[PDB]
Amino acid sequence: VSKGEELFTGVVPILVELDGDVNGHKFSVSGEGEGDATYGKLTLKLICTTGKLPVPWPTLVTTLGYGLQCFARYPDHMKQHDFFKSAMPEGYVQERTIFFKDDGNYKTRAEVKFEGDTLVNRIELKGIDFKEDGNILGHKLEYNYNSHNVYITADKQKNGIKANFKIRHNIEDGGVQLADHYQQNTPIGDGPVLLPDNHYLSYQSKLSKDPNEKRDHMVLLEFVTAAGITTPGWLSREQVFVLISAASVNLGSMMCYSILGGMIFGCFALFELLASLVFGNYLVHIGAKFMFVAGMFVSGGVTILFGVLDRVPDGPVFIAMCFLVRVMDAVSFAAAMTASSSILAKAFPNNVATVLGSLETFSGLGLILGPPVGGFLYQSFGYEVPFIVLGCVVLLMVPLNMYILPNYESDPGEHSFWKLIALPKVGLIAFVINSLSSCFGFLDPTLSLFVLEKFNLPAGYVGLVFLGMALSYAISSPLFGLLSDKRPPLRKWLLVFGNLITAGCYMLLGPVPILHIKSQLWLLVLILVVSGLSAGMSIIPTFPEILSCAHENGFEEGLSTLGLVSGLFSAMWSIGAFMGPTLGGFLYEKIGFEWAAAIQGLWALISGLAMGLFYLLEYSQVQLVESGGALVQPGGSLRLSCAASGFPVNRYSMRWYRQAPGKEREWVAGMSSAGDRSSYEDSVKGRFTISRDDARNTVYLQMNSLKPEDTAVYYCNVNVGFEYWGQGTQVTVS
Numbered sequence: 001v002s003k004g005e006e007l008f009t010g011v012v013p014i015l016v017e018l019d020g021d022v023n024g025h026k027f028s029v030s031g032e033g034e035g036d037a038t039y040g041k042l043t044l045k046l047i048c049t050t051g052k053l054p055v056p057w058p059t060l061v062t063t064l065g066y067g068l069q070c071f072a073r074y075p076d077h078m079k080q081h082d083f084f085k086s087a088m089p090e091g092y093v094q095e096r097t098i099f100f101k102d103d104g105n106y107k108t109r110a111e112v113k114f115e116g117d118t119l120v121n122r123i124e125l126k127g128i129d130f131k132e133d134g135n136i137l138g139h140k141l142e143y144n145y146n147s148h149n150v151y152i153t154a155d156k157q158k159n160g161i162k163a164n165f166k167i168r169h170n171i172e173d174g175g176v177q178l179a180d181h182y183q184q185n186t187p188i189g190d191g192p193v194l195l196p197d198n199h200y201l202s203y204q205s206k207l208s209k210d211p212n213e214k215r216d217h218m219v220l221l222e223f224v225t226a227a228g229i230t231t232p233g234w235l236s237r238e239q240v241f242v243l244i245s246a247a248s249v250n251l252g253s254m255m256c257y258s259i260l261g262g263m264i265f266g267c268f269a270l271f272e273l274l275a276s277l278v279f280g281n282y283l284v285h286i287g288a289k290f291m292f293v294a295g296m297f298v299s300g301g302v303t304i305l306f307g308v309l310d311r312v313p314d315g316p317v318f319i320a321m322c323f324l325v326r327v328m329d330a331v332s333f334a335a336a337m338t339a340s341s342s343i344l345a346k347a348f349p350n351n352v353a354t355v356l357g358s359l360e361t362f363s364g365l366g367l368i369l370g371p372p373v374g375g376f377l378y379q380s381f382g383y384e385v386p387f388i389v390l391g392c393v394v395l396l397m398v399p400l401n402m403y404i405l406p407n408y409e410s411d412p413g414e415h416s417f418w419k420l421i422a423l424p425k426v427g428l429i430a431f432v433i434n435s436l437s438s439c440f441g442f443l444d445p446t447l448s449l450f451v452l453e454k455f456n457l458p459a460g461y462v463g464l465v466f467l468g469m470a471l472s473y474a475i476s477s478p479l480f481g482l483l484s485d486k487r488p489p490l491r492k493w494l495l496v497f498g499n500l501i502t503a504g505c506y507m508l509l510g511p512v513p514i515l516h517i518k519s520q521l522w523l524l525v526l527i528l529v530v531s532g533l534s535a536g537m538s539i540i541p542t543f544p545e546i547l548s549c550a551h552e553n554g555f556e557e558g559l560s561t562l563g564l565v566s567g568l569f570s571a572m573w574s575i576g577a578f579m580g581p582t583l584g585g586f587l588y589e590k591i592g593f594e595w596a597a598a599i600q601g602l603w604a605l606i607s608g609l610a611m612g613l614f615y616l617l618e619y620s621q622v623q624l625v626e627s628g629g630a631l632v633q634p635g636g637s638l639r640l641s642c643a644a645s646g647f648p649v650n651r652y653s654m655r656w657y658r659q660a661p662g663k664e665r666e667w668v669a670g671m672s673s674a675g676d677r678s679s680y681e682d683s684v685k686g687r688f689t690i691s692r693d694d695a696r697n698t699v700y701l702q703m704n705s706l707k708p709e710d711t712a713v714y715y716c717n718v719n720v721g722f723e724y725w726g727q728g729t730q731v732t733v734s
Contacts, residue, residue: 001079002194004088008070010411011036015118016044016064020125023104025054029064033220037085039557040073044220047213055127056141057218058169061205062181063108065220066150067094067121069185070112072201074226076236081196081229083154083161083185089114090189092160094121099180104130135169135177142170142653142673145205146723152228154195160186161196170719174653174670174679199228206721241404242347243355246340247362249296249401252394253336254366256303256387259373264322268330269578273571275334280567284412284560288342293402295336296394302329303391310384334570341566345547346408346559350485353544357481360540364474367467413560420564425549428611429542430572432499435607436538437576439506442584442600443469450510450593455521468525472532477540484541488548491541492615498538499608505531506601510593543569622646624716624726631732638703642716642726650675650694652720656701658712659728668714669701684710708733 014035019028031046044065046057070084084092091113098106110123130137150165162184169177187193206221283291305325312318340359348355377386420426448462484491509527511517546565555561587596625643632638642654656668669680669690678690692699699716711733716726 002082002086002192004085005079005082007088008037008085010038013118014042014044014068015120016046016067016123017120018060018064018123018125020060020123020127022054022125022127023130026050027053027055029053029060035068035071037071037073040071040224042068042071042220042222042224044068044222045210046218046220048216051215053216055136056139057143058141058145058207059106059136059179060125061145061207061220062098062167062179063096063106063110063123063125065205065222066203067110067112067123068119068222069094070119071222072224072226076238077231078196078199078226078229080194081199082226083152083194083196086194087187087189087191090187090191092188093186094183095186096181096183099182100136101178101180102131103134103136103177104128135171140172141177142172142719143207143209144170144719144721145207146170146719147205148203150201150203152196152199152201154197155184156195158184158186159193159195160184168667170653170655171670171679172672173677174655174672176655176667176670197229199226201226204722238406239347241406242344243358245292245401245404246344246359248397249292249336249340250359250363251366251369252397253299253333254363255369256390256394258367258370260306265578265582267323268326269574269582271327272330272334273574273578275331276338276570276574277567279331279335280338280563280570281417282412283338283342283563283567284410287409288339288346288559288563289405289407291335291339292343292405293398295332295334295339296397296401298328298332299336300391300395300398302326302332303387303394307385307387334574337570338563338566341543341569342559342563343405343408345543345562345566352547353481353484353491353541354478355481356543357477357479357540360477361474364470364477367470408559410559413556413564415555415561417564420550420568423549423553424614425611426546426568428614429546429549430568432495432538432607432611433542433569433572434576434579435604436499436502436535437573438580439502439600439604440535441577441580442596445581446584446588446593446596449588451524454519465525465528469528469532472529473536476533476536480537481540484544489621491545492619495538495541495545496608496612496615498534499604500612501534502531502538503601503605503608505534506597506604509601510595510597512594512598620646622718622720622724624718624724626714626716626726626729629714629729629731631734632706634706634708634733636706638706638731640701640703640714640729640731642699642701644697644699644716644718647718647720648694649692649697649699652718654692654699655717656690657715657717657725658710659715660712665715671699703731706733 011034014033016032017030021027028049029046030049031044033042033044035042042065046064070088072082072084074082091111094108094110094112096106096108096110098108100106105128107126108123110121112119112121132138135141146168148165148167150163153162155162164180164182167179167181169179171177202225204223204225208219208221210217210219279286302325305328309318309321309325312321344355344359345352373386377390380386421430447465448459451457451462452459480494484494505527508515508517509531511519543565546568547562550561550565551557584596584600587599590596623645626640627643628638628640651673653671653673655670657665658668659665667681668684669678669688671678671690671692675692675694680686680688680690687704689702689704690699691702701714703710711731713728713730715728718724
């Protein structure tokens with residue numbers, strides 16, 4: 001942990017300057033922008049100062065944007081393997097040699113200094129023996145730039161680091177220009193520097209042009225991720241503390257609710273929805289550490305003040321005190337649910353779906369510990385004071401949770417809330433949670449009364465029925481959260497089919513007389529535990545889906561947009577609990593349970609029908625599939641098909657790449673964006689053939705006179721603005 005990491009928490013300005021010379025032609029560029037190293041983002045706006053550039057812009061991106069090594073996003077594991085910010089305020093020197101294949105050479109000398117809050121790098125270039133008819137001076141490069149991995153090694157003799165890497169440039173004809181970069185990074189400070197081990201940095205790039213700027217300009221968007229060494233498997237000290245603290249608050253919440261589970265419900269549901277909304281909006285401004293101790297402290301008093309309601313007689317001293325308690329029952333659960341969702345998804349960045357299932361399963365052990373209330377606490381005091389004694393250990397979690405939860409801070413986000421509810425996808429997923437919570441809240445007042453009028457069973461015996469539905473939720477929550485995380489494209493099929501079964505289960509719960517199904521006890525047990533399987537399969541992946549929908553729209557990553565999303569998850573769980581039971585008592589008056597379960601499910605039937613056709617009709621994401629590689633004897637012919645989805649193939653180019661086993665990936669063939677020019681590898685020139693079907697959205701590569709040298713895994717490459725590759729298929733010649 002070096003000193004310079006503390007100065008990088010936040011958006012810091014950037015300024016860039018370059019004075020270069022190619023073959024006696026002088027040029028100079030300058031610009032400004034902003035970079036944030038908390039989540040690895042960099043925006044660089046270059047403006048050419050001499051008015052014209054003899055070299056293409058992507059040849060100089062690796063000196064300008066790749067010269068800003070200090071905005072790397074290092075994880076918690078490799079804070080110690082970080083050389084760039086190790087002595088950052090002093091600055092450092094990048095000395096680069098940039099070798100172009102069968103072209104000239106670049107020598108780069110760059111100084112990085114930290115003056116005030118502005119980081120200024122000054123770059124001197126020298127270019128030699130560029131060919132006039134070549135790719136560089138001929139300007140045959142497309143206006144695109146692609147991803148790369150950069151490998152870092154250390155050096156003790158100069159106390160700095162060394163690196164070697166190779167970028168690829170797309171050519172208008174179709175080929176690839178290869179550039180090999182050797183950099184030496186030396187620190188000019190006399191303080192301690194960090195010498196790391198071997199690792200790499202994934203660079204993702206985006207090129208853009210301003211609509212209003214006329215003079216020759218270029219806009220760089222850069223994402224940097226650092227990786228390279230295997231995680232040890234042991235969880236960090238932050239991950240263990242959040243998991244043990246969030247599990248205990250859901251255990252005690254169901255523990256006290258397992259004993260005490262007209263205008264009051266109207267007062268409750270509006271101020272439960274209001275407290276879940278605004279207190280989730282200002283999660284940035286209040287502080288998530290003080291949220292998780294504010295909810296359980298107020299909810300700790302709810303367990304205490306319920307006992308003292310017995311002392312007062314009925315009237316203004318009883319009813320008005322039921323007005324206050326709940327308010328504190330609602331707002332503190334609304335606070336505890338939104339706080340526990342925000343603090344847990346930050347702790348597990350790529351495990352959001354799995355840890356919700358693990359958290360909600362341990363809350364399903366809470367109602368298993370129900371009749372332990374009747375063990376000794378009910379037999380000792382009865383109903384007067386069992387609550388204050390249990391409330392101590394709830395309130396004794398205060399010194400533990402204040403010490404064991406980490407402290408986070410974040411700048412408030414300038415996005416309005418809103419805009420988020422105006423999305424087409426957030427609106428339809430709000431309808432599903434409204435529909436799913438409506439069907440859950442109907443059975444709480446009304447299932448026991450149907451059994452009483454038909455099967456004539458006591459409500460204590462109906463208490464076993466409710467544990468039948470909770471037994472299926474507890475086992476469905478981890479497994480359906482386990483499969484939600486590993487396959488992100490199938491969470492949209494997993495959730496819509498979850499609501500569709502719930503419509504079908506509830507259709508047959510109280511059977512319509514047209515259906516001619518006889519109702520009995522063993523059928524009621526079987527049909528309800530299936531409904532637990534369907535409800536748990538639809539309630540778990542709706543939180544990572546909204547988090548996925550926010551980041552694709554353009555919202556930032558961190559504590560800001562996580563707070564606004566988790567506020568809605570408590571909010572749309574509350575609107576189901578308002579129109580569920582209250583209209584449930586309305587619709588129970590009309591006909592009865594033989595239709596009140598059928599009409600409850602048609603609203604869930606239209607809920608899965610509306611969003612299910614929204615995902616089906618207009619899903620679009622860039623995916624590429626290869627198929628057809630097999631065992632071919634030498635001298636034969638083969639055909640390989642790359643199929644594309646998400647983008648039109650007519651206006652973009654397609655390339656092919658090979659991977660021999662144990663060898664570096666190499667380019668095979670390319671076609672221009674106009675469908676007129678093409679290029680091939682020089683070793684296989686004239687023996688392969690590239691082709692496409694534009695209206696079919698397919699590209700084909702045909703192989704004539706195969707040799708054992710061509711045994712490789714083949715991939716299919718496209719540049720939309722971000723680089724995409726296909727899965728790749730293996731071709732063996734033997």
